[PDB]
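Justification of resources, computational component.

The compute hours requested in this renewal are based largely on the per-chain cost of generating structure records like the one below. Each record pairs the submitted sequence with a full structure-token output. That output is archived, and it is also reused by downstream analysis tasks.
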Amino acid sequence: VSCTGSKDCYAPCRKQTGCPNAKCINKSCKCYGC
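The structure output for this chain reads:
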């Protein structure tokens, strides 16, 4: 699920669980919360 930035990863982050902040890779997104 290739993303671009944290802000990009915020939408899936949220959708999934709702992490405080997120980390992103141009391969996939990374959540915290979860």
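The beta strands are 23-24, 29-30. The first strand starts at residue 23 and ends at 24.
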